[model samples]
Target: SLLVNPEGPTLMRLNSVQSSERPLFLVHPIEGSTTVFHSLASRLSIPTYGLQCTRAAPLDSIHSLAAYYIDCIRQVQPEGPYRVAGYSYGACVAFEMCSQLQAQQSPAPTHNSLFLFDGSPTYVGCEAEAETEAICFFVQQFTDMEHNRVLEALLPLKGLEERVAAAVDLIIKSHQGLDRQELSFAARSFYYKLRAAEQYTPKAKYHGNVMLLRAKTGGADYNLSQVCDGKVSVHVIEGDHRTLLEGSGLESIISIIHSSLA
Candidate 1:
């Protein structure tokens, strides 16, 4: 069912099994809804709640997005020491929320665990020359009307894994519900927000344990060694980032979550 928050709309699906134990909250990425977590949540041992973020507001930034998610958590469990998981960009927001909650001295859950799926520790920045190339590559493939031809051309340079990552990025950008003129505005807005995210750093270290499940063969950017501090545990999953969300890769993710709980 859908719950209307003052910030935006939140879509929630609750697991049938009820436990006095606090719920596991799942946060999704930009241009994505709770649907991505559906299959994985079904296999989880704990009762799960999925949160769909608002794609239409100031939440485009990491800090604002994190605040929005914390509010959603309050609505569902009011006094949660809830287990949280975020995929991709959502994982960054999850970390920030945990930091904010601890700062407020709120009754945040003591046993909170963060699960990051193919996400990095620091926010992505566009200052790097390589990042600029990546952005241009993405914009052309995603914004162009002739996508198939572009994919064919990219195949020679990027190979199958990079090509699939590129395709996933395109799918996410395409789902944002913006028209051509709006797309330009949204692009500028998103670019600046990403810059802001890069500048902002977490004030408090996350006290809770973190688990990172990275893809083995897909995107090189998800290097666990660089991002994961000692506080975080790293596990190598068998597929690329996109594949991890689908097919056999999905089963692998479910197994990882279950094993973590155990």
Candidate 2:
């Protein structure tokens, strides 16, 4: 086995040079934390930990978040073949990490492959829709409102582009009634990432091995290779976006990840 601690899910931190297996750092999407990697972690034979962004972590933009992640990563592993995977908005963060890594030209720990879990690229004017999706994710998690009801509340009152704005109002009222401060903080944290996503993320030219996994059910096209100019391996997984986290979704993701990491 390549891993020294091929055990159950563990929270890793800055440590001494431990083993030959290079840890693959997983970055969570807007909604969840490192717990999201539990299933994925169990399947891996290597020591691993996912980044759990805090309120204190910079959320100014994708680049800022990735820059912060780079700092976090250097402390834990200051050497080459840095393997990373980011889910959803986190995919952007992971890409930025790679971008920064390439730009920094660090003497060691060269940028390695990047694994994207149903992560699609985003540009300007995509914020409103992204916010709507983020709000709907919150609405479903925190409220009893049906997805249709949430959509109705947004679309009928404020055209499609402004639906997320309305959803924000609806979510605020729902939270006030529900009145869970902790839940509210979590919800606000997701919204902060969406705000950052809404802004323009400057693209870069990276030439590294990339594994782009797209869901058969949902998500935009994976056009990351257009500029990557590297060996971009693309594949279609079994389920939709949530599948990357749920049942067979995690399985399929891990299988590809295992083969790639090996």
Candidate 3:
């Protein structure tokens, strides 16, 4: 059984109709909550748990964010020989969680697996750099037309429409008043902070099997093996970042998760 903090809404784990020995934990990206895994959860056979990112809390640094997630996981389960998977930023958190758990001398699971969906470890010369460049690119291209250009550029990406819809859905479903200014401020602040952070190297090599699922199109040219050890296995999916999570591409994502679990 998992424990929930009285102060906050606990993450809901979907129970599988057919019980399996393995546990699947899904971690969402930045500015995203548990709902990101709704589609994938429906297709999975193992009991699935959704882990939320820190909201309304200061996550100025990646280390702090990692600590926040570690605390969340501890508060809920405490003891774990649990399997964890994360998408994008959540994948970064998941890696840190694994490090923290190992540091505590907790017993490692028999078949620990990490499913990194189009995620890279270091940001200095990688995605972080690319995103920073992109911000500048858009800023230059749009000049005074920032918002319009951004919307225009985002609308056509392979899986961006679904991601945009998901974002809108989050705004509506969560019933949280959507303040564009506040949201943009948060996004920019996070981006700058991420860009400013130096490259991160794990303290201990991840002993678990790693599955890197990247998009064939509309994704960066990051080589997962360079950042990870030899134990890592790579798979390419045919879509962009958002595509990896929604629509037909989602089936492939779920398939990867299931195969990894096996």
Best by TM-score: 2
Residue 49 C-alpha lDDT in model 3: 79
lDDT of 3 by residue, 1-262 (tens): 0112222343557555356455677776654466767777777766677775434333455556566666665655565666777777667767666666665664533345677777755522555334544343423332334555444544444442333343333333344565533334334434443543444566665556577777777523254555455367677887887677787677777766665666
Each prediction's total of clashing residue pairs, residues at least 3 apart in sequence or on different chains, is: 1, 3, 0
TM-score of 2: 0.72
lDDT of 2 by residue, 234-261 (tens): 7788787766566777777776777667
Model 1 lDDT tens row, 102-207: 6677455356677887775462322333333333454564555364555354444433344434444554566665233333333333344455556556765556
Task: Looking at model 1, report the run of 10 residues with the lowest lDDT sum.
Answer: 1-10
Per-candidate Cα lDDT values, in order, are 0.60, 0.66, 0.56
How high is each candidate's TM-score?
Answer: 0.65, 0.72, 0.64
Rank the candidate models, highest lDDT first.
Answer: 2, 1, 3
lDDT for predicted candidate 1 compared with the true structure: 0.60
Residue 150 in model 3: lDDT:
47
- lDDT, candidate 2, equals 0.66
Candidate scoring better on lDDT of 1 and 3: 1
- Best of the two (1, 2) by TM-score: 2
